[PDB]
Design a protein around this ligand. Structure first.
Ligand code: HEC
Ligand code: HEC
Ligand code: HEC
Ligand code: HEC
Lengths: 106, 106, 106, 106
């Protein structure tokens, strides 16, 4: 799927996590977030569409999703352990990473 | 694309890197390797097909790719700084990660 | 060093970076920030001193440093490729991560 | 707190994990490993004393500990979930990251 589908999957699961009640909610939402970020790896954003795929901006772009997935999986670890409040806090902290990349390349 | 084709992308680009002469060849191959690993995120391997998608086994399958990509990117940073023998050495050490997953899920 | 000393080091190098002129300056400041974060790994912040050192808050405390270092190394790459404004922007965006840990445990 | 010592706590705790019976042994040992890896961040290994403190090699050295600690925490969450075999296997697959750094810099 293209970047646009995947981003809007990222945003919706962040909200599912916020108005979540039980851990299963959060686990599934976090799992789907990790896949959407992984799926967005191949995409080239429009402002980088004239860059070559091994440029410093393009590399930082992909690296950003790699950091996001590491952060998603850590929150997924809190969800697996039944820590619903913590995973939700961890899910809200993800938008340092969402905003960082939007600022630079969106 | 196909998990198989993704593995072939990793294996063949490992071959390019070993034979390469300049940093740009290795930089490019490493970048194609990270892409192939990200794409394989969505795959279910044949020996894990009758496990739950949220099983500890399918989660570990993905964690393996996250570690791989991190190591690929670590090898790219050396290539970026033009240390080609060092990047090629670092690319060789990746087969410990390829193999670690293979024992488990191939 | 001190948790305080490590914070002030983190604080001072953000200012060095904004006021930098060349990539070597940003690179150097970023490298020290990462060292101060790793060094803080062992600290117990005053608001968590009566918590188990293996509690999810103390694990989350260290994890925050692990995320910060990842973000520092990502901005270091842009500086390594000599893109000083891009690195300066990325450095400033680390503050979102500083703030996140402060709201929880400062 | 010296590199030699930090390596030695990493090696002994990986053996403790290898011989553990209950999760509490694994959790305690993994926790000590993550701490030793962070403590070694500042070291210059003997084979890199003729490089810039910010050479691509010295950065790649520090980066290895950052990837290691991530792997350590991922196995720790398995132990937290009382999955001792999975934690033990995760701890064993850690060798790739130990060996990779040894091959390059020991
Ligand atoms: C972290 C959790 C998030 C969340 C919730 C979102 N993103 Fe991103 N994003 C990136 C880029 C380059 C774009 C532009 C895409 C385009 O212009 O075609 C976006 C876009 C979005 C949107 C708007 C989607 C739309 O329908 O147009 C939304 C809602 C969104 N994002 C949410 C790039 C990145 C990243 C690059 C490394 C990362 C990380 C994120 N975004 C993270 C997130
Ligand atoms: C690391 C750099 C590598 C390299 C060079 C290769 N792989 Fe993998 N791989 C995984 C699984 C489950 C399979 C089985 C696929 C199936 O049977 O459907 C494979 C397979 C391969 C092949 C064989 C291709 C063929 O058609 O026979 C090759 C050449 C290959 N790989 C190269 C799973 C993983 C991982 C999980 C986390 C990781 C990491 C890797 N593989 C890494 C690598
Ligand atoms: C993972 C946790 C964490 C992160 C990340 C973090 N901090 Fe802090 N920092 C703290 C805590 C907790 C305190 C309060 C300690 C105290 O009061 O003794 C603190 C204190 C401080 C202080 C004030 C020190 C004092 O005593 O006056 C400054 C300035 C500061 N941090 C800056 C930063 C900057 C800049 C960053 C990021 C670049 C950062 N911190 C990242 C946890 C964190
Ligand atoms: C990022 C780099 C890095 C990582 C990761 C790393 N090492 Fe090391 N290790 C070194 C270096 C460099 C030395 C050499 C120190 C010296 O010569 O004084 C060393 C030395 C050692 C030694 C002392 C043995 C001897 O004969 O000198 C042991 C034991 C050891 N490492 C075990 C481990 C284990 C176990 C792991 C992971 C679980 C690990 N190392 C991961 C860099 C690393």
């Amino acid at each position: 799927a293209d970047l646009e589908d995947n981003m809007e999957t990222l945003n919706d699961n962040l909200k599912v996590i916020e108005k979540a009640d039980n851990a299963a909610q959060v686990k599934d939402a976090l799992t789907k977030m990790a896949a959407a970020a992984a799926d967005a790896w191949s995409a080239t954003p429009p402002k980088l569409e004239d860059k070559s795929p091994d440029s410093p901006e393009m590399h930082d772009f992909r690296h950003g999703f790699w950091i996001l997935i590491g952060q998603i999986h850590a929150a997924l670890h809190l969800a697996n352990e039944g820590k619903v409040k913590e995973a939700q806090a961890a899910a809200e902290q993800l938008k340092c990473t969402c905003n960082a990349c939007h600022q630079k390349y969106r």
